[PDB]
Coordinates of C-alpha atoms in Angstrom, one line a residue:
X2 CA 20.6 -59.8 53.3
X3 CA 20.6 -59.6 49.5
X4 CA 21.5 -55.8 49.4
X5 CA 23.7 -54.0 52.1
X6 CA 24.1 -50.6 52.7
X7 CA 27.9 -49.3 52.1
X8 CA 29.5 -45.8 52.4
X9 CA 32.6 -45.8 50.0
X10 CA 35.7 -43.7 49.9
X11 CA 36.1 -41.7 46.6
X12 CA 40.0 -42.0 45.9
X13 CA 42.3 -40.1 43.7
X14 CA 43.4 -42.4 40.8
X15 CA 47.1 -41.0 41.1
X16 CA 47.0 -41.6 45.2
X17 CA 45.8 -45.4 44.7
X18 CA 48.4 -47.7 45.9
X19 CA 46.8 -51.1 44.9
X20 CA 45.3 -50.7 41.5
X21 CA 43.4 -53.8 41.4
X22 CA 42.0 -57.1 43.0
X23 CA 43.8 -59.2 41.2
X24 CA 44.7 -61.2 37.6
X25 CA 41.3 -63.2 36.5
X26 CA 37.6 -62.2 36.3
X27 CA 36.6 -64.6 38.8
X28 CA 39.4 -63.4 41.1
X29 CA 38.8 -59.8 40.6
X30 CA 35.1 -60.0 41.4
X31 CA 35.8 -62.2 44.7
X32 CA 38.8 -60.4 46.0
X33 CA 36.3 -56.8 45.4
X34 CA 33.4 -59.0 47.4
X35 CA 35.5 -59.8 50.3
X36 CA 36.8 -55.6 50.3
X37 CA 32.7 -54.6 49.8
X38 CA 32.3 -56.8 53.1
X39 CA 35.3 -56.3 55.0
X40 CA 34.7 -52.0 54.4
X41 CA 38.4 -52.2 52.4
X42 CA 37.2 -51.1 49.1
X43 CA 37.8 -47.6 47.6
X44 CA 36.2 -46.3 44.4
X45 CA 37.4 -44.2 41.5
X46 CA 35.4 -42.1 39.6
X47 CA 35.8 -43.0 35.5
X48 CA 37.2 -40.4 33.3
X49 CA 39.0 -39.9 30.7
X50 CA 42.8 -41.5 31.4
X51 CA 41.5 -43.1 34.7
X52 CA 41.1 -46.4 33.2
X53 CA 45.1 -46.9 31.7
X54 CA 45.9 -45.8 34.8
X55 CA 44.6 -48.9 37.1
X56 CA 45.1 -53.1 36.3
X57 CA 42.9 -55.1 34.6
X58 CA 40.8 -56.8 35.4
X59 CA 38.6 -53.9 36.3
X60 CA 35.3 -54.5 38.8
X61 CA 33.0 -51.5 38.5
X62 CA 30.1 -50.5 40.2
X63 CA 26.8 -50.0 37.9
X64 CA 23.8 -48.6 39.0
X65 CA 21.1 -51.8 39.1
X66 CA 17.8 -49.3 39.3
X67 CA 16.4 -46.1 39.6
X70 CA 17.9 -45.0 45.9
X71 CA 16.8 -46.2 49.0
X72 CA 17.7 -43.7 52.1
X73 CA 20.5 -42.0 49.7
X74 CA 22.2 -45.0 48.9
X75 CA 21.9 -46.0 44.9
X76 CA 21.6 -49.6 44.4
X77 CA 24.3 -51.4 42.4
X78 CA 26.0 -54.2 41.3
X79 CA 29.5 -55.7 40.1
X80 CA 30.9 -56.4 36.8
X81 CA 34.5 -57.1 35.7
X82 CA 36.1 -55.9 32.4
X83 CA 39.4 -57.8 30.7
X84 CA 40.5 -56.4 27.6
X85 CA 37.3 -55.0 26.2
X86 CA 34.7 -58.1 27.3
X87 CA 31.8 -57.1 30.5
X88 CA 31.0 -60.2 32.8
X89 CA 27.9 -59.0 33.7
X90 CA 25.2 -56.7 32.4
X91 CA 23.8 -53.6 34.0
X92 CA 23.5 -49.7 34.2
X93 CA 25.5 -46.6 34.1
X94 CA 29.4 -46.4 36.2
X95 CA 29.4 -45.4 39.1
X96 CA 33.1 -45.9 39.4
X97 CA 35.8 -48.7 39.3
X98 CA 36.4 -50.7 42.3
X99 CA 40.1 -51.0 44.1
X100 CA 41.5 -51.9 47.3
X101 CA 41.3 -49.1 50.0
X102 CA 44.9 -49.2 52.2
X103 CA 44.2 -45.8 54.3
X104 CA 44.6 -43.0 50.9
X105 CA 42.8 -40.2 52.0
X106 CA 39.3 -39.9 50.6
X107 CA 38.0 -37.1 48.6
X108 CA 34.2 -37.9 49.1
X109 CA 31.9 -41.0 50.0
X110 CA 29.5 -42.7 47.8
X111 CA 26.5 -44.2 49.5
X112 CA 25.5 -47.6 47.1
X113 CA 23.2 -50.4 48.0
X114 CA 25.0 -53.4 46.9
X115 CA 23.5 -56.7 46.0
X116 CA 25.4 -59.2 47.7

């Protein structure tokens, strides 16, 4: 399938334990892939002081259109020092690895895989 149906837990910045995928773009992007797939991803809402608080590279999740059964369609894109690889809507939140924190809510997302 092009697009698959996720539930994702909303996490804390402060209770993150592993504050990113990994140390390049392409590795970033991957490593949040294989967590999107293997239902090991969290996601952390953007605001201010979030950001300086997890590693770059950041993946975030932006919304691709305007929600099939409840779940907003989206796709990735990686930050590193100020440059986007990728091009599309509004955060929806920044991507991380999910290690058992306890979620505050769930984000329904249709992701193109």
């Amino acid at each position: 399938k092009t697009h698959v149906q996720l539930s994702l837990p909303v996490l804390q910045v402060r209770d993150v334990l592993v504050r990113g995928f990994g140390d390049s773009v392409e590795e970033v992007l991957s490593e949040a892939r294989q967590h999107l797939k293997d239902g090991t991803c969290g996601l952390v809402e953007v605001e201010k002081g979030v950001l300086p608080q997890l590693e770059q590279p950041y993946v975030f999740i932006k919304r691709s259109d305007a929600a099939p059964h409840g779940h907003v369609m989206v796709e990735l894109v990686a930050e590193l020092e100020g440059i986007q690889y990728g091009r599309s809507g509004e955060t929806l939140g920044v991507l991380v690895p999910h290690v058992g924190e306890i979620p505050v809510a769930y984000r329904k997302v249709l992701l193109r895989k």
